[PDB]
Amino acid sequence: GDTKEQRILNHVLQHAEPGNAQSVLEAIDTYCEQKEWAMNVGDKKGKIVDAVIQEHQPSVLLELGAYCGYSAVRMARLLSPGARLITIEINPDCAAITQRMVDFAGVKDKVTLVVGASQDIIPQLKKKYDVDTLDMVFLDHWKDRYLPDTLLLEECGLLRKGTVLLADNVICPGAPDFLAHVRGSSCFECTHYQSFLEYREVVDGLEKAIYKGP
Ligand SMILES: C[S@@+](CC[C@H](N)C(=O)[O-])C[C@H]1O[C@@H](n2cnc3c(N)ncnc32)[C@H](O)[C@@H]1O
Ligand SMILES: O=[N+]([O-])c1cc(O)c(O)c([N+](=O)[O-])c1
Ligand SMILES: [Mg+2]
């Protein structure tokens, strides 16, 4: 229990039910709201993530920024057999926690965790990971990467008509350059979902940006 991330994992291992994704999510959200705040998308914004997945029904989903595995577990529990969630995480210590969290929650057969920076892995997705085009992307890494990685996904041929981009924290801490680009571009159709910062009462929101073709 030397780091906050280790303490979150240990709380799950001691209080949640093995193989039960819902139980894992509830243990993380309770510990973080009351004992140690952490940057998981959380239970309130997580209901918005769930609704986007339920409506669009992606089969190939990419996540940028895994942290401790909360959002990977939350999205994977909604996917159909044979779906794939690929999640990219730059920090090795967080990647090791994420794989343990995914294993414990019972969702490992749906998840492929990649250790590395988003901008190094994105150009490898077709030839090394067998991706054709993505159905959905969850953007939740450092906010200065949202716009350059959106441009890189397009340049690498990974977006099709109907691909869903869903971005966390577009208000707090904010992603203004990303928002101005997708909202002004004729290549995206955008919807804003206003909510709150995880575990707290500061206002936040997510943006859904649906690709329309080049
Ligand atoms: C907000 S946390 C992710 C929270 C996770 N989506 C959830 O809701 O449970 C952001 C993460 O992005 C990772 N990160 C930052 N820059 C990155 C990059 N260029 N590629 C991949 N991961 C990155 C950080 O190390 C950190 O674990
Ligand atoms: O500082 N914060 O409140 C957050 C919240 C978040 O949900 C984040 O994703 C974040 N980050 O990636 O830097 C920071
Ligand atoms: Mg976030």
Q: What is the DSSP secondary-structure string of 134-192?
A: -SEEEE-S-GGGHHHHHHHHHHTT---TTPEEEES-IIIII-HHHHHHHHH-TTEEEEE
Rounded distance, CA 85 to CA 54, Å?
A: 15
Sorted by where each starts, the structural domains of the chain and their CATH numbers stand as 1-214 (3.40.50.150)
46 Cα: distance to centroid of ligand 1 (angstroms): 16
Contact 41, 74 (CB under 8 A): yes
Residue 143 known to be catalytic = yes
Q: Is the peptide bond before 92 cis (omega within 30 degrees of 0)?
A: no
**Binding site for Mg(2+): what residues are annotated?**
140, 168-169
- 140: annotated active-site residue: yes
Ligand 2 proximal residues by C-beta, below 6 Å = 39, 140, 142, 168-169, 173, 197-198
Say what the resolution is, in angstroms: 1.3
> In one letter, which amino acid is 138?
F
Look up residue 20 and give its amino acid: N
Q: How was this structure determined?
A: X-ray
Cα three-residue angle 176-177-182, rounded to 5 degrees: 100
35 catalytically annotated: no
**Which value, in Å, is the radius of gyration of the alpha carbons in the chain?**
16
Residue 134 Cα distances to 2, 31, 130, 157, 210, angstroms:
37, 33, 11, 10, 12
Distance between Cα 171 and ligand 2 center (Å) = 11
